[PDB]
Amino acid sequence: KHSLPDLPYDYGALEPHINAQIMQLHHSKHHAAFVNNLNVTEEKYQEALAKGDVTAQIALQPALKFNGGGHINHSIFWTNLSPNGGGEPKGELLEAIKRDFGSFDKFKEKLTAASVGVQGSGWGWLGFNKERGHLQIAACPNQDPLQGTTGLIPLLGIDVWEHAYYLQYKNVRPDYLKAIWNVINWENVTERYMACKK
Amino acid sequence: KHSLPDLPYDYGALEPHINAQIMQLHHSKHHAAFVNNLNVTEEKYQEALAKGDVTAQIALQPALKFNGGGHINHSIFWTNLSPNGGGEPKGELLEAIKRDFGSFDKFKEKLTAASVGVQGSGWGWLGFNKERGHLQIAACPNQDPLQGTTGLIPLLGIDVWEHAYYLQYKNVRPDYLKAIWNVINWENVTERYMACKK
Amino acid sequence: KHSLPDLPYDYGALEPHINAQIMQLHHSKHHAAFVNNLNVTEEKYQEALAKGDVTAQIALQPALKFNGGGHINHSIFWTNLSPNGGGEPKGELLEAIKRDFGSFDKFKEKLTAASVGVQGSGWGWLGFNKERGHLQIAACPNQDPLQGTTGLIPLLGIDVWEHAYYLQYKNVRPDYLKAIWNVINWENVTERYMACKK
């Protein structure tokens, strides 16, 4: 049975970049609901599965992808954020970024562009491409999770659902993106990255 | 050249159901941006078309559908609301609703469910199916407009992008849906309906 | 564990409308593979499910929908075809068709159009809409099954994957559609329909 992870920190710990109200709603309402609906959906899917009811199995897919994906994505996102965050990565991950994108600031420009470019709801990602052995930026619609839908390993996600920023930044997604760089947990991203070098 | 239509009322006219801050942002920022991007995309498409640049044309399609759709949808939406609206429609539209959905209450439930059910950004619609000669509810993703993507003539739209409600209703989409019924302009919906009597 | 249904008839029994070669390949190769891959995929899904591996669950969805859907769709399609088929339905189903589409020939025109209009692979369907209580035509992409993805109950399906006709009709899908009316099992469609009137 899945459950809602606690944050590594207090709801106000990312101010002023992400205010407390958004963090509270985002965690305790949006993510909580994903977990609840995921549990429901998985239980329904097992019943369908046991019965070899393929029509029901297929009818359950939108809910599983949306809620399952929301659970995966948000779980990663809190670990990707930290009051102790911001600045620049160092060591191999910084070397990898320079190698694959030219430099850190070119990387930021590219992930910003992928995130601002989502028309509708979705996520921008820095991922790791296992078969190519290098970093890769991708954007995902709605709650479609990166690994499940692209095969890429998620390292850093930027939520660009309106609920992630609207109470603070209103319609100006690029101010949100500028501010979020101050709370990125590069320690976590580096752990995710080093886990890929196996 | 497309233009941003004025609202048929002041930004505060739909209080307390939809507050003034949302109406002002929704019209002055979101819709405004759709209009300019639509105009720019149309001019780019003319150039691509004049050179027979098929790749350019296809690459422009997402911006044309998103911004053109956005302009269509919001232009309809403002006319679908009124400070003087609410309650039940009068005349033939109510009888069509009873014929096709069983009753007004049943219809409201269906349109509400279609709207609350969008798993991402989008719109709920009451449409007219000209081929079948009856009403039809449908949901559309992002800014994909009803007529251009499904053929159905839009009668009433409910915006369920988060920007349509978040500042007031936070994550609670059903509270927004319950409130909006108080400001439906049935005169406008009837006008749109009668124009389908074909 | 799912399995491949035997046809109600011999591979050559729909000649000259659908030749034996297509029926043999279509059943013993295309459908067989759907069943095989569906079984594999369901077994993998249970393992994922037991483990609460949502990323794997989501990664399995394309295969389940495609192969599961291919199993659902083809299973229905053979029952929808018969050497004993063709002509016109009678009784309530014919009455329903006249009611909802004007007449049988208007219905044929509409299902033909939905089937010929698929750009790519897919299916045209006559379905039953439970909540509206009437017939409904819809088209589905690839092997996306009607009930699983639209909620409509399938009554009659027309396969418009190229493998359904190419060896005989080559690129001319409209000759295929004209010919298939001669082998439709209206007895079966009527059973499916009457099962919906509950």
Place this chain on the structure above:
Amino acid sequence: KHSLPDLPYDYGALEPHINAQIMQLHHSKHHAAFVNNLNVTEEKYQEALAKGDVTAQIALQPALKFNGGGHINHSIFWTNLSPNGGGEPKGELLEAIKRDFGSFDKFKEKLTAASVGVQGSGWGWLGFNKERGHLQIAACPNQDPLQGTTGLIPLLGIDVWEHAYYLQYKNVRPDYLKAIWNVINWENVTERYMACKK
């Protein structure tokens, strides 16, 4: 006005790998139809654009992408094949393949897997990622063209619509993929590659 390009060789030139009946149908029927529908759709779009009919424009998008994409893709495909092709590419393209995929064999496996893996109609592509300055494999659905929908410059395409192989290889897509390697025009693929050296 777009035109149907002549093949750079006779319909039988690619025997026995792709037979003459397929080449003749593929070019004279499938591609021919894409060209006329593209031209007609472009003229319709000009009219819609000139009137500011956004709904009309959006309604034309599926035909423009499908027929325009079809024209793009097949125009590339014919040039990607040769009676004089096969074997391994010479020069820098082979070294780029080794750099990006590990070796030619590995590349062939990846492109084969991307192609055989399309769950419906579509195309497998070897592309160039101008932003990353390296090769990239991708699959596209239906006739969605590579550059206009992903940004990647097409170098080599493999058609995996059933019409590309069915008359010869029946359902066995892998046998078609194994054969087509015998007729790849690496001179053309190299030309396309060198043009990306940007």
